[model samples]
Target: MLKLLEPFDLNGLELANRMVMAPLTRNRAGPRFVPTKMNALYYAQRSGLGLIITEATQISQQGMGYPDTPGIYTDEQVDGWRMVTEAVHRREGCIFLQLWHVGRVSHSSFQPNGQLPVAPSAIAPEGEVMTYDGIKPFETPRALETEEVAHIVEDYRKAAINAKRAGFDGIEIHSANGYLLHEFLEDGTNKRTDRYGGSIENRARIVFEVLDAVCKVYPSRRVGIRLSPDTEFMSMSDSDRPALYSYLVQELSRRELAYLHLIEPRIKGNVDVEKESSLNVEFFRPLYKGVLITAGGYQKETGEERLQKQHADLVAYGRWVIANPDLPSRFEQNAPLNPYDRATFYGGNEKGYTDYPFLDPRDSQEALKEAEAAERKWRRL
Candidate 1:
């Protein structure tokens, strides 16, 4: 009943724990979309997480929506990411690069030459995305031509190569969360009757193709994919969430990817039925036939229980991890936690980024010295 604390293997890579770090986009990359030391330090601080999934990173200029998010398509960006992977490896943490392409969830300001964002069809997303200037309404994106789909596939393939060069343990294709590949999966967003749209098999084509390309670089056990069933953000929704995702995961299993990370949606007020009954983890368990990662607002007890039942092999935490640097230890000890401040979550200058305190024993001596210095200053005053 307590094997949750035992070490496990995901595809062959050793994991010290079953706790996975959920990918949260903080948009901390500096100009030119290069990762900075601050980003590296922020990740290193959380090395205690058994598996770290870096924030969704754009694969190309056309794939970008938000400002300052890192990219993996460029040489400079790859070099910057190498530092991050190296640091995590030094701490014995395995990290996967999440490759992203936000199709129509963008404004002209973020595009080169102010061109409109591209999607499966020239449709506008329901909400605005965070751009360089500010919150702007989504543009009616241009539909990629038949030939253009090939380019997008190649873009992901090349991005996977860059991730390998950057020293990532593997890459997670950002097919969920209403991104480009998701736009094609959602029928309302993709009105095309061509080979890329319509049937479930056709809609799943691009993802499989991209997976085929990424697999060329690494083994199936090392590659991973993230999916959000019935995710409504960026105007994403399918006619049948259960059918689509069930079929999707069943199909994904054939590829034998390292793991399938599912962002389980909340059921009461949320769209997904999986979370309402906690059946998502169970339902996906057999279908995926590999490691399954369940993420979203998870508690240690619940996660441990899931791991014990084999409902999920790993659990990824986003909010709790943000505020707790030593989250694995905290979970192991049931320590009191610091609450997260939402205001400073994105585009910050490191106030909330790196200021989270951990229970480092080395700080005891520093604390004593600082306390004495404070007394001396007060006496002089």
Candidate 2:
């Protein structure tokens, strides 16, 4: 029942356990947009998990949307990431850097030369984005010219090469969660007349291009992609989600990727979700042939259920790991977990980033139970 604690082999690479540290962006890069030792320590503390997917990192400056998120377009950024990769490796853990481009989810304040952020279409998401100046309403992003699209593909290839230089065990293409690749995949956001738009096959083109380019830099076994079939964010919508994903998932099965990470159906961006759903891991299980990773609002109970059912090979946890640095051991003993403070979840220092309690944490008996139930109702499944 608890095979979640067992080792998982990804292609030829061995993972320590079935538990994966899902990528969480804390915006620790400051003005430099480079990873520091603090980021290294925060990730190293969670190296107990089988694998770690680092926070979404920008493939280029123009690809950035949020303030203080790290980038991988330069030699300096490569060296900065090396510090993090070496730290996790020193702890005998495997980690993958998630490549990201925020598409229309950005403001001019975060763009180079204060130009509009690029996307598949010029449509704007109806919400505010975190920029260096402050939160600002979204802008109608510039649609990429066909040649410009090709350049961005080259950007992804370069980033993949930089990731290899950074000494990562593997690289995960951040193709989900309403980012650049996702923006192109969904019809509602991709209102382009170019070859990159219209029809499922055309929309899924960039995803494959990025994957194929990355695979050339690193073998297919060292490349992975994250796909959010139903979980929503950034006003994302598709007429038939299943139809679009069925083709994508089926096509992905033939590629022999290191793993195909799927975020199970849930709310747009919330942890709480309806227990029942027609779309979940079970839907994509048969379509995907290689290692499959399921994530999104999973607790130990539900995590056990999914793994035992043989639907997904591994489970990735974000908040659970953030609050419990020693999460693997905590789950091993069924120990109480510290609650995460949502206030400090985005941009923060060590206070909420690295100060979470470990086992034998300093808390009174009564307080411990209260704390346990606080996050337990959500995490207990």
How close is each model in CA RMSD to the real structure? 6.9, 7.4
- Candidate 1 lDDT over 24-125, as tens digits, reads 788889779988667776777777788999999999988988878999988889877876776666667789999999898777898889998999999897
Q: What value of lDDT does candidate 1 attain over all alpha carbons?
A: 0.79
**Which stretch of 10 consecutive residues in model 2 shows the poorest summed lDDT?**
371-380
Best by TM-score: 2
TM-score of 1: 0.91
Candidate 1 Cα errors over 4 Å, as ranges: 1-3, 267-279, 361-381
Instruction: List runs of model 2 lying over 4 Å from the truth.
Output: 273-276, 360-381
Which ten residues in a row are the worst by lDDT in model 1? 267-276
